[PDB]
PDB file of C-alpha atoms and ligand atoms in Angstrom:
ATOM      1  CA  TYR A  35       0.000   0.000   0.000  1.00  0.00           C
ATOM      2  CA  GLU A  36       3.082   2.209   0.227  1.00  0.00           C
ATOM      3  CA  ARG A  37       3.164   4.611  -2.722  1.00  0.00           C
ATOM      4  CA  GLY A  38       5.840   7.032  -3.853  1.00  0.00           C
ATOM      5  CA  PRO A  39       9.377   7.521  -2.551  1.00  0.00           C
ATOM      6  CA  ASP A  40      10.385   7.852   1.082  1.00  0.00           C
ATOM      7  CA  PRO A  41       9.117  11.134   2.571  1.00  0.00           C
ATOM      8  CA  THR A  42      11.082  13.967   4.093  1.00  0.00           C
ATOM      9  CA  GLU A  43       9.514  17.090   5.554  1.00  0.00           C
ATOM     10  CA  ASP A  44      10.236  18.762   2.201  1.00  0.00           C
ATOM     11  CA  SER A  45       8.170  16.246   0.212  1.00  0.00           C
ATOM     12  CA  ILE A  46       5.076  16.488   2.417  1.00  0.00           C
ATOM     13  CA  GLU A  47       5.314  20.297   2.335  1.00  0.00           C
ATOM     14  CA  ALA A  48       5.564  20.098  -1.463  1.00  0.00           C
ATOM     15  CA  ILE A  49       2.717  21.739  -3.356  1.00  0.00           C
ATOM     16  CA  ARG A  50       2.801  18.836  -5.836  1.00  0.00           C
ATOM     17  CA  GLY A  51       3.468  15.191  -5.066  1.00  0.00           C
ATOM     18  CA  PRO A  52       5.218  12.480  -7.082  1.00  0.00           C
ATOM     19  CA  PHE A  53       2.073  11.767  -9.151  1.00  0.00           C
ATOM     20  CA  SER A  54       0.275  13.607 -11.938  1.00  0.00           C
ATOM     21  CA  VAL A  55      -3.407  14.082 -11.125  1.00  0.00           C
ATOM     22  CA  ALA A  56      -6.377  13.837 -13.473  1.00  0.00           C
ATOM     23  CA  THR A  57     -10.035  14.651 -12.882  1.00  0.00           C
ATOM     24  CA  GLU A  58     -13.508  13.359 -13.685  1.00  0.00           C
ATOM     25  CA  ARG A  59     -16.685  15.418 -13.336  1.00  0.00           C
ATOM     26  CA  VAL A  60     -19.669  13.774 -11.630  1.00  0.00           C
ATOM     27  CA  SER A  61     -23.204  14.976 -12.333  1.00  0.00           C
ATOM     28  CA  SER A  62     -25.384  16.282  -9.519  1.00  0.00           C
ATOM     29  CA  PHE A  63     -28.021  13.658 -10.383  1.00  0.00           C
ATOM     30  CA  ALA A  64     -25.878  10.839  -8.988  1.00  0.00           C
ATOM     31  CA  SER A  65     -27.731   9.015  -6.237  1.00  0.00           C
ATOM     32  CA  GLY A  66     -27.458  10.227  -2.654  1.00  0.00           C
ATOM     33  CA  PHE A  67     -25.370  13.390  -3.083  1.00  0.00           C
ATOM     34  CA  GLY A  68     -24.943  16.422  -5.311  1.00  0.00           C
ATOM     35  CA  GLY A  69     -21.943  15.308  -7.338  1.00  0.00           C
ATOM     36  CA  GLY A  70     -18.440  16.688  -7.476  1.00  0.00           C
ATOM     37  CA  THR A  71     -14.973  16.277  -8.953  1.00  0.00           C
ATOM     38  CA  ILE A  72     -12.828  13.139  -8.673  1.00  0.00           C
ATOM     39  CA  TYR A  73      -9.098  13.844  -8.504  1.00  0.00           C
ATOM     40  CA  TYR A  74      -7.036  10.716  -9.122  1.00  0.00           C
ATOM     41  CA  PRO A  75      -3.432   9.811  -9.971  1.00  0.00           C
ATOM     42  CA  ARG A  76      -2.749   8.888 -13.581  1.00  0.00           C
ATOM     43  CA  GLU A  77       0.204   6.507 -13.177  1.00  0.00           C
ATOM     44  CA  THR A  78      -1.252   3.070 -12.388  1.00  0.00           C
ATOM     45  CA  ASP A  79       2.087   1.267 -12.094  1.00  0.00           C
ATOM     46  CA  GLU A  80       2.614   1.620  -8.332  1.00  0.00           C
ATOM     47  CA  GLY A  81      -0.760  -0.102  -7.844  1.00  0.00           C
ATOM     48  CA  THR A  82      -4.203   0.993  -6.732  1.00  0.00           C
ATOM     49  CA  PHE A  83      -4.873   3.884  -4.353  1.00  0.00           C
ATOM     50  CA  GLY A  84      -7.100   4.623  -1.398  1.00  0.00           C
ATOM     51  CA  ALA A  85      -9.770   7.301  -1.583  1.00  0.00           C
ATOM     52  CA  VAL A  86     -11.056  10.196   0.516  1.00  0.00           C
ATOM     53  CA  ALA A  87     -14.368  12.056   0.228  1.00  0.00           C
ATOM     54  CA  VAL A  88     -14.335  15.766   1.099  1.00  0.00           C
ATOM     55  CA  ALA A  89     -17.425  17.658   2.277  1.00  0.00           C
ATOM     56  CA  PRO A  90     -17.887  21.451   2.287  1.00  0.00           C
ATOM     57  CA  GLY A  91     -19.430  23.459   5.086  1.00  0.00           C
ATOM     58  CA  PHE A  92     -22.923  24.849   5.520  1.00  0.00           C
ATOM     59  CA  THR A  93     -24.069  26.981   2.562  1.00  0.00           C
ATOM     60  CA  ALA A  94     -20.966  26.136   0.548  1.00  0.00           C
ATOM     61  CA  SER A  95     -19.850  24.006  -2.389  1.00  0.00           C
ATOM     62  CA  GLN A  96     -16.822  22.009  -3.518  1.00  0.00           C
ATOM     63  CA  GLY A  97     -15.110  25.196  -4.693  1.00  0.00           C
ATOM     64  CA  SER A  98     -14.473  25.918  -1.015  1.00  0.00           C
ATOM     65  CA  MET A  99     -12.494  22.645  -0.832  1.00  0.00           C
ATOM     66  CA  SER A 100     -11.145  22.476  -4.396  1.00  0.00           C
ATOM     67  CA  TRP A 101      -7.518  23.047  -3.390  1.00  0.00           C
ATOM     68  CA  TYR A 102      -7.413  19.674  -1.609  1.00  0.00           C
ATOM     69  CA  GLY A 103      -8.041  17.980  -4.963  1.00  0.00           C
ATOM     70  CA  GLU A 104      -4.811  18.023  -6.964  1.00  0.00           C
ATOM     71  CA  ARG A 105      -2.718  18.702  -3.835  1.00  0.00           C
ATOM     72  CA  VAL A 106      -3.356  15.491  -1.900  1.00  0.00           C
ATOM     73  CA  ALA A 107      -4.126  13.362  -4.970  1.00  0.00           C
ATOM     74  CA  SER A 108      -0.630  14.080  -6.324  1.00  0.00           C
ATOM     75  CA  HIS A 109       0.839  12.489  -3.191  1.00  0.00           C
ATOM     76  CA  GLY A 110      -1.080   9.302  -4.040  1.00  0.00           C
ATOM     77  CA  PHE A 111      -4.811   9.364  -3.287  1.00  0.00           C
ATOM     78  CA  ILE A 112      -8.221   9.541  -4.917  1.00  0.00           C
ATOM     79  CA  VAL A 113      -9.828  12.792  -3.736  1.00  0.00           C
ATOM     80  CA  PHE A 114     -13.537  13.544  -4.219  1.00  0.00           C
ATOM     81  CA  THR A 115     -14.684  17.105  -3.486  1.00  0.00           C
ATOM     82  CA  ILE A 116     -18.445  16.595  -3.374  1.00  0.00           C
ATOM     83  CA  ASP A 117     -21.498  18.832  -3.424  1.00  0.00           C
ATOM     84  CA  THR A 118     -24.356  18.189  -1.021  1.00  0.00           C
ATOM     85  CA  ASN A 119     -28.031  17.761  -1.911  1.00  0.00           C
ATOM     86  CA  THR A 120     -29.084  21.189  -0.638  1.00  0.00           C
ATOM     87  CA  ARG A 121     -26.827  23.960   0.638  1.00  0.00           C
ATOM     88  CA  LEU A 122     -28.547  23.742   4.054  1.00  0.00           C
ATOM     89  CA  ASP A 123     -27.814  20.096   4.903  1.00  0.00           C
ATOM     90  CA  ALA A 124     -27.296  19.378   8.600  1.00  0.00           C
ATOM     91  CA  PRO A 125     -24.124  17.530   9.697  1.00  0.00           C
ATOM     92  CA  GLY A 126     -26.009  14.235   9.929  1.00  0.00           C
ATOM     93  CA  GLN A 127     -27.089  14.470   6.294  1.00  0.00           C
ATOM     94  CA  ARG A 128     -23.561  15.406   5.216  1.00  0.00           C
ATOM     95  CA  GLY A 129     -22.423  12.127   6.763  1.00  0.00           C
ATOM     96  CA  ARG A 130     -24.859  10.093   4.663  1.00  0.00           C
ATOM     97  CA  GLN A 131     -23.949  12.031   1.516  1.00  0.00           C
ATOM     98  CA  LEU A 132     -20.260  11.478   2.274  1.00  0.00           C
ATOM     99  CA  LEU A 133     -20.937   7.725   2.257  1.00  0.00           C
ATOM    100  CA  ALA A 134     -23.036   7.908  -0.921  1.00  0.00           C
ATOM    101  CA  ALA A 135     -20.068   9.581  -2.627  1.00  0.00           C
ATOM    102  CA  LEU A 136     -17.703   6.806  -1.527  1.00  0.00           C
ATOM    103  CA  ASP A 137     -20.197   4.167  -2.675  1.00  0.00           C
ATOM    104  CA  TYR A 138     -20.404   6.001  -6.006  1.00  0.00           C
ATOM    105  CA  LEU A 139     -16.616   5.728  -6.312  1.00  0.00           C
ATOM    106  CA  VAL A 140     -16.882   1.961  -5.780  1.00  0.00           C
ATOM    107  CA  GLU A 141     -20.086   1.067  -7.637  1.00  0.00           C
ATOM    108  CA  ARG A 142     -20.585   3.761 -10.296  1.00  0.00           C
ATOM    109  CA  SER A 143     -17.353   5.683 -10.960  1.00  0.00           C
ATOM    110  CA  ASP A 144     -15.918   5.856 -14.484  1.00  0.00           C
ATOM    111  CA  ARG A 145     -13.633   3.001 -15.544  1.00  0.00           C
ATOM    112  CA  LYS A 146     -10.544   5.225 -15.337  1.00  0.00           C
ATOM    113  CA  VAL A 147     -11.430   5.930 -11.700  1.00  0.00           C
ATOM    114  CA  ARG A 148     -12.630   2.395 -10.947  1.00  0.00           C
ATOM    115  CA  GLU A 149      -9.372   0.784 -12.092  1.00  0.00           C
ATOM    116  CA  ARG A 150      -7.148   2.880  -9.804  1.00  0.00           C
ATOM    117  CA  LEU A 151      -9.292   2.455  -6.666  1.00  0.00           C
ATOM    118  CA  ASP A 152      -8.811  -0.015  -3.826  1.00  0.00           C
ATOM    119  CA  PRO A 153     -12.444  -0.110  -2.613  1.00  0.00           C
ATOM    120  CA  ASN A 154     -11.427  -1.292   0.881  1.00  0.00           C
ATOM    121  CA  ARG A 155      -9.265   1.698   1.914  1.00  0.00           C
ATOM    122  CA  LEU A 156     -11.656   4.655   2.180  1.00  0.00           C
ATOM    123  CA  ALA A 157     -11.810   7.798   4.307  1.00  0.00           C
ATOM    124  CA  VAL A 158     -13.716  11.038   4.859  1.00  0.00           C
ATOM    125  CA  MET A 159     -12.738  14.687   5.254  1.00  0.00           C
ATOM    126  CA  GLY A 160     -14.855  17.761   5.823  1.00  0.00           C
ATOM    127  CA  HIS A 161     -14.992  21.447   6.724  1.00  0.00           C
ATOM    128  CA  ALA A 162     -17.304  23.060   9.308  1.00  0.00           C
ATOM    129  CA  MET A 163     -20.643  21.182   9.154  1.00  0.00           C
ATOM    130  CA  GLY A 164     -18.796  18.869   6.773  1.00  0.00           C
ATOM    131  CA  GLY A 165     -16.493  18.115   9.703  1.00  0.00           C
ATOM    132  CA  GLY A 166     -19.479  17.307  11.860  1.00  0.00           C
ATOM    133  CA  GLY A 167     -20.605  15.162   8.944  1.00  0.00           C
ATOM    134  CA  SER A 168     -17.128  13.652   8.988  1.00  0.00           C
ATOM    135  CA  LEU A 169     -17.695  12.576  12.603  1.00  0.00           C
ATOM    136  CA  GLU A 170     -21.135  11.167  11.778  1.00  0.00           C
ATOM    137  CA  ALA A 171     -19.971   9.120   8.777  1.00  0.00           C
ATOM    138  CA  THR A 172     -17.486   7.400  11.100  1.00  0.00           C
ATOM    139  CA  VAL A 173     -20.302   6.385  13.456  1.00  0.00           C
ATOM    140  CA  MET A 174     -22.340   5.471  10.367  1.00  0.00           C
ATOM    141  CA  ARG A 175     -19.596   3.272   8.849  1.00  0.00           C
ATOM    142  CA  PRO A 176     -16.873   2.134  11.275  1.00  0.00           C
ATOM    143  CA  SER A 177     -14.930   0.449   8.445  1.00  0.00           C
ATOM    144  CA  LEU A 178     -13.530   3.797   7.257  1.00  0.00           C
ATOM    145  CA  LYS A 179      -9.758   4.190   7.454  1.00  0.00           C
ATOM    146  CA  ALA A 180      -9.453   7.890   8.341  1.00  0.00           C
ATOM    147  CA  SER A 181     -11.517  10.917   9.348  1.00  0.00           C
ATOM    148  CA  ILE A 182     -10.331  14.532   9.193  1.00  0.00           C
ATOM    149  CA  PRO A 183     -12.747  17.193  10.550  1.00  0.00           C
ATOM    150  CA  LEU A 184     -11.574  20.678   9.534  1.00  0.00           C
ATOM    151  CA  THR A 185     -12.911  23.390  11.886  1.00  0.00           C
ATOM    152  CA  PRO A 186     -15.864  21.048  12.512  1.00  0.00           C
ATOM    153  CA  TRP A 187     -19.341  22.068  13.639  1.00  0.00           C
ATOM    154  CA  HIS A 188     -21.775  19.829  15.507  1.00  0.00           C
ATOM    155  CA  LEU A 189     -24.376  20.244  18.242  1.00  0.00           C
ATOM    156  CA  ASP A 190     -23.474  16.856  19.738  1.00  0.00           C
ATOM    157  CA  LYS A 191     -20.394  17.173  21.942  1.00  0.00           C
ATOM    158  CA  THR A 192     -19.730  13.514  22.853  1.00  0.00           C
ATOM    159  CA  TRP A 193     -18.194  11.143  20.292  1.00  0.00           C
ATOM    160  CA  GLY A 194     -17.099   8.156  22.373  1.00  0.00           C
ATOM    161  CA  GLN A 195     -18.428   5.508  19.973  1.00  0.00           C
ATOM    162  CA  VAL A 196     -16.044   6.514  17.157  1.00  0.00           C
ATOM    163  CA  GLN A 197     -13.501   3.905  16.047  1.00  0.00           C
ATOM    164  CA  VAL A 198     -11.888   5.678  13.067  1.00  0.00           C
ATOM    165  CA  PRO A 199      -8.519   7.446  13.555  1.00  0.00           C
ATOM    166  CA  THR A 200      -9.728  11.052  13.664  1.00  0.00           C
ATOM    167  CA  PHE A 201      -7.627  14.205  13.143  1.00  0.00           C
ATOM    168  CA  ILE A 202      -9.447  17.377  14.224  1.00  0.00           C
ATOM    169  CA  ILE A 203      -7.779  20.565  12.983  1.00  0.00           C
ATOM    170  CA  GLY A 204      -8.640  23.643  15.028  1.00  0.00           C
ATOM    171  CA  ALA A 205      -8.511  27.389  14.391  1.00  0.00           C
ATOM    172  CA  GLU A 206      -7.492  29.724  17.210  1.00  0.00           C
ATOM    173  CA  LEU A 207      -9.763  32.656  16.320  1.00  0.00           C
ATOM    174  CA  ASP A 208     -12.751  30.642  15.060  1.00  0.00           C
ATOM    175  CA  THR A 209     -15.950  32.177  16.441  1.00  0.00           C
ATOM    176  CA  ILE A 210     -18.464  30.334  14.231  1.00  0.00           C
ATOM    177  CA  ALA A 211     -17.509  26.845  15.443  1.00  0.00           C
ATOM    178  CA  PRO A 212     -15.201  27.906  18.287  1.00  0.00           C
ATOM    179  CA  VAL A 213     -12.688  25.316  19.434  1.00  0.00           C
ATOM    180  CA  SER A 214     -13.577  25.685  23.124  1.00  0.00           C
ATOM    181  CA  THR A 215     -17.125  24.419  22.483  1.00  0.00           C
ATOM    182  CA  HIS A 216     -16.706  22.402  19.264  1.00  0.00           C
ATOM    183  CA  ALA A 217     -13.266  21.205  18.179  1.00  0.00           C
ATOM    184  CA  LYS A 218     -11.923  20.585  21.701  1.00  0.00           C
ATOM    185  CA  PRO A 219     -14.908  18.787  23.333  1.00  0.00           C
ATOM    186  CA  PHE A 220     -15.199  16.732  20.140  1.00  0.00           C
ATOM    187  CA  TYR A 221     -11.597  15.538  20.425  1.00  0.00           C
ATOM    188  CA  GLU A 222     -11.653  14.953  24.191  1.00  0.00           C
ATOM    189  CA  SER A 223     -14.821  12.839  23.949  1.00  0.00           C
ATOM    190  CA  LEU A 224     -13.127  10.607  21.394  1.00  0.00           C
ATOM    191  CA  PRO A 225     -11.988   7.370  23.077  1.00  0.00           C
ATOM    192  CA  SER A 226      -8.622   7.813  24.776  1.00  0.00           C
ATOM    193  CA  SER A 227      -7.548   4.526  23.152  1.00  0.00           C
ATOM    194  CA  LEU A 228      -8.333   5.874  19.687  1.00  0.00           C
ATOM    195  CA  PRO A 229      -5.476   6.975  17.416  1.00  0.00           C
ATOM    196  CA  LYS A 230      -6.304  10.674  17.272  1.00  0.00           C
ATOM    197  CA  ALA A 231      -4.836  14.165  17.202  1.00  0.00           C
ATOM    198  CA  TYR A 232      -5.880  17.799  17.588  1.00  0.00           C
ATOM    199  CA  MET A 233      -4.011  20.577  15.777  1.00  0.00           C
ATOM    200  CA  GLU A 234      -4.998  24.180  16.508  1.00  0.00           C
ATOM    201  CA  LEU A 235      -3.699  26.874  14.158  1.00  0.00           C
ATOM    202  CA  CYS A 236      -2.386  30.144  15.581  1.00  0.00           C
ATOM    203  CA  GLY A 237      -4.410  33.178  14.519  1.00  0.00           C
ATOM    204  CA  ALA A 238      -6.589  31.115  12.187  1.00  0.00           C
ATOM    205  CA  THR A 239     -10.255  31.776  11.454  1.00  0.00           C
ATOM    206  CA  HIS A 240     -13.136  29.460  10.581  1.00  0.00           C
ATOM    207  CA  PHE A 241     -12.209  29.700   6.888  1.00  0.00           C
ATOM    208  CA  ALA A 242      -8.472  28.985   7.102  1.00  0.00           C
ATOM    209  CA  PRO A 243      -9.020  25.434   5.691  1.00  0.00           C
ATOM    210  CA  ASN A 244     -10.515  26.926   2.504  1.00  0.00           C
ATOM    211  CA  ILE A 245      -7.232  28.331   1.139  1.00  0.00           C
ATOM    212  CA  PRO A 246      -3.902  26.512   0.599  1.00  0.00           C
ATOM    213  CA  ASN A 247      -2.120  26.014   3.918  1.00  0.00           C
ATOM    214  CA  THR A 248       1.157  24.098   4.138  1.00  0.00           C
ATOM    215  CA  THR A 249       0.528  23.334   7.816  1.00  0.00           C
ATOM    216  CA  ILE A 250      -2.859  21.775   7.024  1.00  0.00           C
ATOM    217  CA  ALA A 251      -1.762  19.929   3.886  1.00  0.00           C
ATOM    218  CA  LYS A 252       1.423  18.346   5.249  1.00  0.00           C
ATOM    219  CA  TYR A 253      -0.308  16.582   8.158  1.00  0.00           C
ATOM    220  CA  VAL A 254      -3.518  15.734   6.320  1.00  0.00           C
ATOM    221  CA  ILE A 255      -1.177  13.945   3.907  1.00  0.00           C
ATOM    222  CA  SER A 256       0.660  12.299   6.811  1.00  0.00           C
ATOM    223  CA  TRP A 257      -2.632  11.258   8.422  1.00  0.00           C
ATOM    224  CA  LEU A 258      -4.106   9.921   5.173  1.00  0.00           C
ATOM    225  CA  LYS A 259      -0.836   8.123   4.422  1.00  0.00           C
ATOM    226  CA  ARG A 260      -0.505   6.569   7.882  1.00  0.00           C
ATOM    227  CA  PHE A 261      -4.057   5.240   8.216  1.00  0.00           C
ATOM    228  CA  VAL A 262      -5.489   4.882   4.703  1.00  0.00           C
ATOM    229  CA  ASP A 263      -2.229   3.537   3.227  1.00  0.00           C
ATOM    230  CA  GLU A 264      -1.180   1.844   6.511  1.00  0.00           C
ATOM    231  CA  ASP A 265       2.035   3.758   5.799  1.00  0.00           C
ATOM    232  CA  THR A 266       4.241   3.938   8.892  1.00  0.00           C
ATOM    233  CA  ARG A 267       6.751   6.010   6.888  1.00  0.00           C
ATOM    234  CA  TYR A 268       4.649   9.027   7.946  1.00  0.00           C
ATOM    235  CA  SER A 269       4.630   8.498  11.724  1.00  0.00           C
ATOM    236  CA  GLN A 270       7.857  10.522  11.998  1.00  0.00           C
ATOM    237  CA  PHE A 271       5.827  13.683  11.342  1.00  0.00           C
ATOM    238  CA  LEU A 272       2.857  12.717  13.548  1.00  0.00           C
ATOM    239  CA  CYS A 273       4.656  11.299  16.606  1.00  0.00           C
ATOM    240  CA  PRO A 274       5.839  13.001  18.627  1.00  0.00           C
ATOM    241  CA  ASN A 275       3.562  16.034  18.376  1.00  0.00           C
ATOM    242  CA  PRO A 276       4.589  18.434  15.575  1.00  0.00           C
ATOM    243  CA  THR A 277       6.138  21.669  16.821  1.00  0.00           C
ATOM    244  CA  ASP A 278       5.578  24.066  13.923  1.00  0.00           C
ATOM    245  CA  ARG A 279       5.240  27.783  14.593  1.00  0.00           C
ATOM    246  CA  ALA A 280       1.778  28.064  12.968  1.00  0.00           C
ATOM    247  CA  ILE A 281       0.521  25.592  15.613  1.00  0.00           C
ATOM    248  CA  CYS A 282      -0.686  27.007  18.929  1.00  0.00           C
ATOM    249  CA  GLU A 283      -1.754  23.720  20.541  1.00  0.00           C
ATOM    250  CA  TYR A 284      -1.241  20.066  19.656  1.00  0.00           C
ATOM    251  CA  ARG A 285      -2.801  17.039  21.344  1.00  0.00           C
ATOM    252  CA  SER A 286      -2.601  13.371  20.397  1.00  0.00           C
ATOM    253  CA  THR A 287      -2.612   9.787  21.651  1.00  0.00           C
ATOM    254  CA  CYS A 288       0.890   9.159  20.306  1.00  0.00           C
ATOM    255  CA  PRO A 289       2.652   6.898  19.608  1.00  0.00           C
ATOM    256  CA  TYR A 290       0.944   5.241  16.646  1.00  0.00           C
TER     257      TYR A 290
HETATM  258  O1  LIG B 596     -26.050  29.005  13.458  1.00  0.00           O
HETATM  259  C1  LIG B 596     -26.062  28.553  12.284  1.00  0.00           C
HETATM  260  O2  LIG B 596     -27.136  28.554  11.624  1.00  0.00           O
HETATM  261  C2  LIG B 596     -24.781  28.007  11.657  1.00  0.00           C
HETATM  262  C3  LIG B 596     -24.823  27.471  10.384  1.00  0.00           C
HETATM  263  C4  LIG B 596     -23.665  26.975   9.810  1.00  0.00           C
HETATM  264  C5  LIG B 596     -22.463  27.001  10.488  1.00  0.00           C
HETATM  265  P1  LIG B 596     -20.933  26.329   9.660  1.00  0.00           P
HETATM  266  O3  LIG B 596     -19.810  26.182  10.657  1.00  0.00           O
HETATM  267  O4  LIG B 596     -21.207  24.993   9.018  1.00  0.00           O
HETATM  268  O5  LIG B 596     -20.483  27.393   8.490  1.00  0.00           O
HETATM  269  C6  LIG B 596     -19.990  26.899   7.281  1.00  0.00           C
HETATM  270  C7  LIG B 596     -18.662  27.586   6.982  1.00  0.00           C
HETATM  271  O6  LIG B 596     -18.091  27.013   5.843  1.00  0.00           O
HETATM  272  C8  LIG B 596     -18.736  27.371   4.657  1.00  0.00           C
HETATM  273  C9  LIG B 596     -17.808  28.242   3.814  1.00  0.00           C
HETATM  274  C10 LIG B 596     -16.712  27.676   3.185  1.00  0.00           C
HETATM  275  C11 LIG B 596     -15.873  28.468   2.419  1.00  0.00           C
HETATM  276  C12 LIG B 596     -16.122  29.822   2.278  1.00  0.00           C
HETATM  277  C13 LIG B 596     -17.219  30.386   2.906  1.00  0.00           C
HETATM  278  C14 LIG B 596     -18.062  29.596   3.672  1.00  0.00           C
HETATM  279  C15 LIG B 596     -22.421  27.543  11.763  1.00  0.00           C
HETATM  280  C16 LIG B 596     -23.579  28.044  12.346  1.00  0.00           C
HETATM  281 CA1   CA B 597     -28.138  13.945  -6.505  1.00  0.00          CA
END
């Protein structure tokens, strides 16, 4: 499941990975969700790849997450920035629609996408209410390999039944889904035996995940490599806790 050459901190911080990405547009009339764009590596010689499904926040679309497409997928992943059914979907519905996008990748995706996909190594990512929907899709399908809630928003504060390795990225100055009442109590109610981490960004707002951010990208790549690819070549950056300057607080259940 290991793809690409051995990583240094300069390769994870790279804006482009060792693979050339291609895309495939998915209609909004696909069952269960509002469609999106499927970013996938072109070179099929290193084998098949795992996949992640990315959800945008409340009253937002995949354009708010588009920069995760070619970025992560060039490091060796299938990335699916999806649109929801309506722009007002609650976090619970964004969980379902995250799973209907993954199922679409397995059961209905184009042949070029189907051939490069390992349908057993799947994951979810999401921003704001898409991060709450990231937490729900874990509860809804415990077979998922990774879960990455970006500045997540949810009314439910306790998430002790989650079994997926979850990486909650926080934003210091977020006042829409503030970390003290959302991102932190979400992480602390995750099971202490779960492989998990909490990264809070200094001076960041609710919308920091919507523009390219080397701090966000380098450890989303490490997290998706470690748990979707079972790639222990990326534990060096996760354990012990990263000590970057753009990070104001880091918490984790290291080592893993
Ligand atoms: O009180 C409420 O009604 C309420 C509703 C929704 C939220 P949420 O945290 O989901 O906001 C989504 C932010 O992301 C969407 C976005 C992405 C990129 C650019 C601009 C906007 C919080 C409170
Ligand atoms: Ca639809």
